[PDB]
Each structure stands twice: as C-alpha cells, then as structure tokens.
Amino acid sequence: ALWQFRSMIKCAIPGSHPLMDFNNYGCYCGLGGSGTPVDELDRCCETHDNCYRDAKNLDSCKFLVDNPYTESYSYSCSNTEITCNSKNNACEAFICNCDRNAAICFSKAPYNKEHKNLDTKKYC
Numbered sequence: 680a681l682w683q684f685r686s687m688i689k690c691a692i693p694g695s696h697p698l699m700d701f702n703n704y705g706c707y708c709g710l711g712g713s714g715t716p717v718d719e720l721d722r723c724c725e726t727h728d729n730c731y732r733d734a735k736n737l738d739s740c741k742f743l744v745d746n747p748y749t750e751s752y753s754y755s756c757s758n759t760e761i762t763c764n765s766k767n768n769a770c771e772a773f774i775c776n777c778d779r780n781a782a783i784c785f786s787k788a789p790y791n792k793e794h795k796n797l798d799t800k801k802y803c
C-alpha cells in the first residue's frame with residue numbers, strides 16, 4: 680500500500696518528521712481539495728494528491744489494478760534525490776514519481792506547526 684512511502688520520506692528529509700507529524704495537518708489532503716493550503720506543506724500534499732489523480736486515469740498498469748501504491752515499487756535517495764528503483768519502468772515509475780515529490784517536498788515546503796491537526800474555518 681502507502682507504506683514504503685514512510686521509507687521514502689526518511690530518505691528525502693534531512694531534519695523534518697514524516698506522517699507522524701505530517702499526515703494529520705493542513706486543509707486539502709484527500710483527492711482534489713482546492714481552497715488553497717494554509718501554509719504550503721498542505722501544498723506538498725497538493726502535488727502528490729493531483730499526481731495520484733493522474734494514477735486513477737493511468738493507461739500503463741490500469742485501475743482495475745485497484746491501488747498499486749508500493750506492492751510494485753521501492754526507491755532511491757539521497758540529497759534529498761528521491762526517484763525510484765533505478766531500472767525505472769512505466770507504472771512502477773509513475774506512482775514512485777508522485778511519491779518522490781511527496782518525499783522531496785516535505786523538505787521543500789514551509790511546514791504546518793499550526794494547521795498540524797487543523798482548524799479550517801480558518802486557513803483555506
């Protein structure tokens with residue numbers, strides 16, 4: 680499932696904590712969502728959830744394959760530098776290229792300390 684995604688975000692994140700802090704926070708972290716964020720660390724959930732939108736469409740391994748979120752792929756690191764298993768294929772490549780920007784961009788964004796299990800009649 681989404682679980683070698685936690686393996687993923689240790690790799691890309693010098694300093695900041697994954698899911699344990701991250702997955703609760705900010706306004707728009709299902710599929711679609713759009714107000715804006717709150718701070719832009721709901722904005723790194725924006726890009727991985729709208730790349731996972733293009734995964735429900737996806738012609739390479741197509742979704743009668745119901746949810747291929749890790750039983751299929753793992754990844755490479757290590758600046759951040761997250762990618763994929765380095766042969767990188769068609770659909771092993773696509774779902775690891777959404778789950779890359781996920782991992783990287785929790786190191787790219789201004790974090791929610793604040794929206795951290797959120798408010799929003801407020802931020803969005």
Ligand SMILES: [Ca+2]
Pocket residue numbers: 707708709710711712713725728
């Ligand atoms: Ca969303």
